[PDB]
Amino acid sequence: QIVVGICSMAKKSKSKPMKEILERISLFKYITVVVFEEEVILNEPVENWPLCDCLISFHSKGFPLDKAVAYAKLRNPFVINDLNMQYLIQDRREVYSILQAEGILLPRYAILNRDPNNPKECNLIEGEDHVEVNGEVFQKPFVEKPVSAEDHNVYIYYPTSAGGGSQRLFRKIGSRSSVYSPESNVRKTGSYIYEEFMPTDGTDVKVYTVGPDYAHAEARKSPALDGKVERDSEGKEVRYPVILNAREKLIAWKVCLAFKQTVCGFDLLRANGQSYVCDVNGFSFVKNSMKYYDDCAKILGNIVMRELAPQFHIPWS
Ligand SMILES: Nc1ncnc2c1ncn2[C@@H]1O[C@H](COP(=O)(O)OP(=O)(O)NP(=O)(O)O)[C@@H](O)[C@H]1O
Numbered sequence: 126q127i128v129v130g131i132c133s134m135a136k137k138s139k140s141k142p143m144k145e146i147l148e149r150i151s152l153f154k155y156i157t158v159v160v161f162e163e164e165v166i167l168n169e170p171v172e173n174w175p176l177c178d179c180l181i182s183f184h185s186k187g188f189p190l191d192k193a194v195a196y197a198k199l200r201n202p203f204v205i206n207d208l209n210m211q212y213l214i215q216d217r218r219e220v221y222s223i224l225q226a227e228g229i230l231l232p233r234y235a236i237l238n239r240d241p242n243n244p245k246e247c248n249l250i251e252g253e254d255h256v257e258v259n260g261e262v263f264q265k266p267f268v269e270k271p272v273s274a275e276d277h278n279v280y281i282y283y284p285t286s287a288g289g290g291s292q293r294l295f296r297k298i299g300s301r302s303s304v305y306s307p308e309s310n311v312r313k314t315g316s317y318i319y320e321e322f323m324p325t326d327g328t329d330v331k332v333y334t335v336g337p338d339y340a341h342a343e344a345r346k347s348p349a350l351d352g353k354v355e356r357d358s359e360g361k362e363v364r365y366p367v368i369l370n371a372r373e374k375l376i377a378w379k380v381c382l383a384f385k386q387t388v389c390g391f392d393l394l395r396a397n398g399q400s401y402v403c404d405v406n407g408f409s410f411v412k413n414s415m416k417y418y419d420d421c422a423k424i425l426g427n428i429v430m431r432e433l434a435p436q437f438h439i440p441w442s
Pocket residue numbers: 232268270274276277278279294320321322323324328329347348349392394403404406
């Protein structure tokens with residue numbers, strides 16, 4: 126049997142979408158799935174981790190990515206989502222740098238790197254209705270993102286003409302994804318990316334790749350609007366159907382390959398007749414879609430079989 130090893134925190138490895146996909150990959154005649162226990166990931170040296178031929182592994186909070194990297198170097202499995210790229214995915218500066226290099230449209234942006242021992246010495250000038258970062262002017266509305274992609278405290282600053290203040294976004298707390306604040310001035314500690322605010326119809330397009338030639342997309346209310354989460358009768362967040370256009374399918378192809386993440390989530394802002402990438406999240410599954418579960422498992426299994434059947438002498442067309 127070809128062994129597909131799953132290496133992530135238990136919250137992820139035991140999530141419903143993970144279980145739905147793994148039960149389906151297990152239906153492949155020549156594939157066995159082995160899910161690495163969290164206690165092993167955290168407490169055992171990599172030399173003791175289960176063997177696999179193909180490794181599906183991804184960082185989330187508390188995950189020892191250094192160990193996953195060392196395991197992959199030690200065992201040389203076929204890696205579905207590249208591990209070293211997952212250090213870069215944690216840094217919004219590195220994400221935007223890769224997107225730029227790939228000719229991918231993204232919001233006009235500037236990086237404010239602030240020295241925590243000399244915080245007033247960074248390249249920031251502030252007006253009541255704009256900031257100037259490294260000399261570049263961003264008129265309000267503009268967006269302020271922590272350089273850490275794991276920090277979801279993204280702020281939007283409203284122009285005086287709209288009443289000023291700001292919208293403070295955060296990891297969804299039950300019924301809310303943002304709150305209005307009267308504060309009009311930008312944060313004065315930390316490093317940030319400042320970006321132009323892209324006007325959309327008030328929704329985000331969420332894209333989920335499984336290899337570069339498959340991408341499921343759906344839309345959700347932007348947390349940049351009022352911040353009240355829309356929920357249906359079953360209690361799940363409202364999603365809107367999306368079909369990606371030719372340009373966006375190419376964006377998906379580029380993102381997947383550029384970040385070397387077979388399974389890759391990213392966000393699009395449909396603004397001014399184009400689509401702009403504002404976020405790349407790496408490993409991410411769609412929830413509550415039986416067709417996605419089917420498709421994703423089939424694609425991943427086929428990828429595994431295509432790559433490894435020859436060395437295993439398994440017939441595969
Ligand atoms: N430049 C922009 N213009 C307009 N809206 C933006 C812009 N940047 C981000 N937003 C909005 O703010 C939301 C959050 O920003 P995003 O860069 O996705 O942060 P995040 O913290 O990485 N969120 P997550 O998808 O959970 O990882 C986006 O989904 C958009 O609705």
